[PDB]
Structures are given as C-alpha cells and as structure tokens.
C-alpha cells in the first residue's frame, strides 16, 4: 500500500478578493492543516469566478497575510442545493502533494459528478 491522505484535513471560513482592497468579507471555504507554529491553509473554494487576493489577519493582530491565486479549475458537485457551479482555487506555489490531499478528501466525502 502507498497512499495520499491517511487521516484527513479540515476547513474554517475565509475571506478573499480580486484587487489589493477587494479583501472585503467572508468569501471562501479554505481548508487547512495544523503546523507547530502558525497554521497554513491549503485550498480556496467558493462561488468566486476571478479572485486573486485571499486574506486573513496575523496571529499578533499586527499584519494580515497576502495571497495570490492561480488560474481556475472547473467542477460541479451535488448537494440538496443541486449542481453548485463553483471554482476552487489553490494558493500560489502549492505543490502537488497538497493539491493531492485537498482533491482527495474533497472528492471523497464532498460530492461531485
């Protein structure tokens, strides 16, 4: 056996934007994993079409993290809402293993057709 994600990951709320100041309000579904100091989020997903800036403050409250996003990827899934035409975005520079775990858990327990 050689596997992708033995144990899974999580997600809390998040905000994003397009321009430098479009960092307005809670706008994504950003997954994350726990690091010893500072927690790194993996995948940005919501009903966003062209968004470049995904934002959240510093643990100190002093700064606020800045992120640039990639080009989009298509997918439509199943829910009692029905076909959710979404776009999920990966932060800049996400390597292949992290995308692998994200897509793994998502397509595993989050519907998709």
């Amino acid at each position: 056996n050689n596997e992708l994600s033995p144990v899974a990951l999580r997600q809390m709320s998040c905000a994003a934007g397009t321009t430098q100041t479009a960092c307005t309000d809670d706008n994504a579904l950003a997954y994350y994993n726990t690091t010893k100091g500072g927690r790194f989020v993996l995948a940005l997903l919501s009903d966003l079409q062209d968004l470049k800036w995904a934002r959240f403050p510093k643990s100190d409250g002093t700064g606020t993290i800045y992120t640039e996003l990639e080009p989009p990827c298509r997918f439509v899934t199943d829910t009692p809402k029905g076909p959710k035409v979404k776009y999920l975005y990966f932060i800049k520079g996400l390597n292949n293993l992290n995308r692998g775990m994200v897509l793994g858990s998502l397509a595993a327990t989050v519907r998709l057709q």
């Binding site: 056996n1 050689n2 596997e3 992708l4 033995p6 144990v7 990827c73 298509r74 997918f75 390597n95 292949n96 293993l97 995308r99 692998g100 897509l103 793994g104 397509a107 595993a108 998709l112």
Partner: protein, 311 residues
C-alpha cells in the same frame, strides 16, 4: 484438469497462450520483493513478502522459456470495479500494461480475478534496492538481472573481485549496459503522467508498479477528478531513483545526432560555452512533473538549499 487446466485456458484469453504454471495449481505464489510503502501504520523502503498471485510463464517456439509472465491477482469485489473503471479511463496509453477482468468458480463461489499480461520477472524497485543495499555475499537478484538483459554472462562472476571499483574497473562497462532500459523507463513515465493529467486521475507513483520494460499497473490507490485536473505525485520515485542514473550512464544517447545510438556524435561549435537552453530542454524532456523550480545558473538561487537542489 477441469480446475487447473480450465483456469490455465481462461488465463490465456485471445492472445498467444503457451503458458506454464510457475508454481502449483490454482493457489497463490509467495516471493520476497522490495516495496515502497506508506499507510497510517507502516512506512519505509524495505523487502516484504508477497502472497496473493499465481504466475504463469510464457513459452517461446521450441518450448524455450522467455522473460514474459502473466500475473493473475485475486481480491475483493469493490477493488475489482474500482480498478476496472480507472483502467478503462486510462486504457489507451502505450505506457500501460494490458489488463483482463473475469470471474471464475473456485469451489462453490465465483471469485473475481485480474490478469496482467506479458510482465517482467522484476520491477524497478528491485533494481534500485539491489544497487542501494549491496552485499557481496548475498547478491543473487543483481546477478540474475545482469545476465537476463545481456550485460554479461555467468562466467563473469568467477573472476572474483568482479564487483570492486578500484580492482576491476571494467564493471563500469557492464553497469553502463543497463542505461538505455532506464532511459526508456523515464520516457514512459512522462507519457503516463500526461495521460493521468488529461483523464482526471490522482495518485502517487512508486517504483514497484513499473516493470523493467517500462509499463505501469496497479490503480488501487487512485481517485477521480474532473478531466483536465489530474495530479501525479512523483517525489519519492525520482529521488529514490536518482543515484542510478549516473551509475548506469543513462543519458548517453543525447550525445548522438538524433538521440540515436547507431549514429555519429554531435559536432559542437568550439567557441560555445553557454548551453543554458539545452539544460532546460533536457529538464523538460525527462522531469516534466517535478514541481520545484530549476535554475540552470546557480547565481540566481534563493538560499543554499536551492543551490544544492539545482547543482
């Protein structure tokens, strides 16, 4: 001869069929082989014991045995459908071995089987393990690999000190006879990654799922995305194999006119020293899905970890 011979006739399918049970009747065959493992219980690159296949060797004309095998797995029913789905998604790549799904009655139940056709006795993991854990009193796998692919013959292992690098530096000439096999394996790996990206398949590539001809199998840990978004993970494959590319001198064919070993060497300009574009072409041809940035000139690196990586 209605349960050992009926099985042997169903395994042949519609291809050439001169097989022989490399074992006993319709029970399995156990062997000691090298694997690259990672689940939530165990990890490592070690030698384990395989226990769930029945292997048949193909005969040639004159009834001479050749290096082509049929490996018939046996397992549960959900893995069967999952593997069939993924295989039918990927079945048109030339770098994928040919599969065959069927059901058969063992005693009173219909058990599902998966057959893999014209495999090789050893994988790439066996070669890498043989060369990275060398012991001169226990090296039967290495000798068998060397003899099978016509690098040397069985009398080469009598002029003892045959393995030493300082005494008998002729062993480099023998190791360099395995190089074109390794180069062909690399090219097929890139093909397979492209197919995976197009179909929408996600999974990690390991050395024990490729035979010594270059073909791939075992899609049991692979999942599905939407087409155009597949992700191959290649980080232990390439780096575990890295020391073997300079020992076998795999990239030698790139000094010839058309990457053809039967042709003259390339004639270069005598005042040329840059070669930056050629390095990028080589990197794109053999390591297309290695996802860390490569700087041909190390004056543009970010720290000393980057310098090590790119050098």
């Amino acid at each position: 001869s209605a349960d050992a011979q009926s099985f042997l006739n169903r395994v042949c399918g519609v291809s050439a069929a001169r097989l022989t049970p490399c074992g006993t009747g319709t029970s399995t065959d156990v062997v000691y082989r090298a694997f690259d493992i990672y689940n939530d219980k165990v990890a490592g690159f070690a030698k384990f014991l395989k226990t769930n296949c029945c292997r048949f060797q193909e005969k040639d004309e004159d009834d001479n045995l050749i290096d082509s095998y049929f490996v018939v797995k046996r397992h549960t029913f959900s893995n069967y459908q999952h593997e069939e789905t993924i295989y039918n998604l990927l079945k048109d790549c030339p770098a994928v071995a040919k599969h065959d799904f069927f059901k058969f009655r063992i005693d009173g139940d219909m058990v599902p089987h998966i057959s893999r056709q014209r495999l090789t006795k050893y994988t790439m993991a066996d070669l890498v393990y043989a060369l990275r854990h060398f012991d001169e009193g226990n090296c039967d796998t290495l000798k068998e690999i060397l003899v099978t692919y016509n690098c040397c013959d069985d009398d080469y292992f009598n002029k003892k000190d045959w393995y030493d690098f300082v005494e008998n530096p002729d062993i480099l000439r023998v190791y360099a006879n395995l190089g074109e096999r390794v180069r062909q394996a690399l090219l097929k790996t890139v093909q397979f990654c492209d197919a995976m990206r197009n179909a929408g398949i996600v999974g990690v590539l390991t050395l024990d799922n490729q035979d010594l001809n270059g073909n791939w199998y075992d899609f049991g840990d692979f999942i599905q995305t939407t087409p155009g978004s597949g992700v191959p993970v290649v980080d232990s494959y390439y780096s575990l194999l890295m020391p073997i590319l300079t020992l076998t001198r795999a990239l030698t064919a790139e000094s010839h006119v058309d990457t053809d070993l039967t042709k003259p060497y390339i004639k270069w300009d005598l005042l040329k020293y840059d070669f930056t574009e050629e390095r990028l072409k080589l990197f794109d041809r053999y390591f297309k899905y290695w996802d860390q940035t490569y700087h041909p000139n190390c004056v543009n690196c970010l720290d000393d970890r980057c310098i090590l990586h790119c050098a």
